[PDB]
Design a protein around this ligand. Structure first.
Ligand SMILES: NC(=[NH2+])c1ccc2[nH]c(-c3cc([C@@H](CC(=O)[O-])C(=O)[O-])cc(-c4ccccc4N)c3[O-])nc2c1
Ligand SMILES: [Ca+2]
Ligand SMILES: [Cl-]
Length: 223
């Protein structure tokens, strides 16, 4: 997260870290046995880490559970990153409490101007790599579709939205991918891509979760 702030331990109880010997993507707990992340964060050998703050120290509250299966959206396109969403089922359910809780799926899509909270252990520099130990947060508004399309002409599908600041300085970045964009207490986006991080006129592009609710629900129901 570039230009963000330290969240505070466990203030984002739905945030998860996908780990394969190191943190590679974030994700969101949507129920005690399922997580939502981005399809491009897929790989085998994933361990889901819940209740984390400092990812390099066991401070307590952590639950490390292996993924039983990962379901990448069948229509995911790696070249355009359209349908960049993935569901991960956990081998055993997580014990939910105040430090580990699920976030709700939306009923409606959010509007431009909606303010949301983006979090993750991704890079904090736009020029170079500096990864943090604790979770970083950023408050960012959803931009209008015309501003999004003007910034990424021909690359925005109806399953994406932009959120951020056109002046640069604040954005999500590598390592934040797969994590949550929560607005008014509902999971509205998934960190997906962007051009560099926090560059002027190149905002973050997120997966528009509201378009996948029926799919997420049907898929969980049949697995
Ligand atoms: N500016 C943004 N809002 C933004 C948001 C999420 C991003 N995720 C990534 C991202 C970048 C990479 C690098 C890899 C490298 O330079 O070593 C790449 O391919 O350009 C990789 C991933 C990535 C790809 C597969 C699995 C986990 C990952 N973290 C990113 O999400 N960039 C991002 C940029
Ligand atoms: Ca830890
Ligand atoms: Cl266009």
């Amino acid at each position: 997260i570039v230009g963000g702030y330290t969240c505070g331990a466990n203030t984002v109880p739905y945030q998860v870290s996908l780990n394969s010997g190191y943190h590679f993507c974030g994700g969101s707990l949507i129920n005690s046995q399922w997580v939502v992340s981005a399809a491009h964060c897929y790989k085998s050998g994933i361990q889901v880490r819940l209740g984390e703050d400092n990812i390099n120290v066991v401070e307590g509250n952590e639950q490390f559970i292996s993924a039983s299966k990962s379901i990448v959206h069948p229509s995911y396109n790696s070249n355009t990153l359209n349908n960049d969403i993935m569901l991960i089922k956990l081998k055993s359910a997580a014990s939910l409490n105040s430090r580990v809780a699920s976030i709700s799926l939306p009923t409606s899509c959010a509007s431009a101007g909606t303010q949301c909270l983006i979090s993750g252990w991704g890079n904090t520099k736009s020029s170079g790599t500096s990864y943090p130990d604790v979770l970083k947060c950023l408050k960012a508004p959803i931009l209008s579709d015309s501003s999004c399309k003007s910034a990424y002409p021909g690359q925005i599908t109806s399953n994406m939205f932009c959120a951020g600041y056109l002046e640069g300085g604040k954005d999500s970045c590598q390592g934040d991918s797969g994590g949550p964009v929560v607005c008014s207490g509902k999971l509205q986006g998934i960190v997906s891509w962007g051009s560099g991080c926090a560059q002027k006129n190149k905002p973050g592009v997120y997966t528009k979760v509201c378009n996948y609710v029926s799919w997420i629900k049907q898929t969980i129901a049949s697995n």
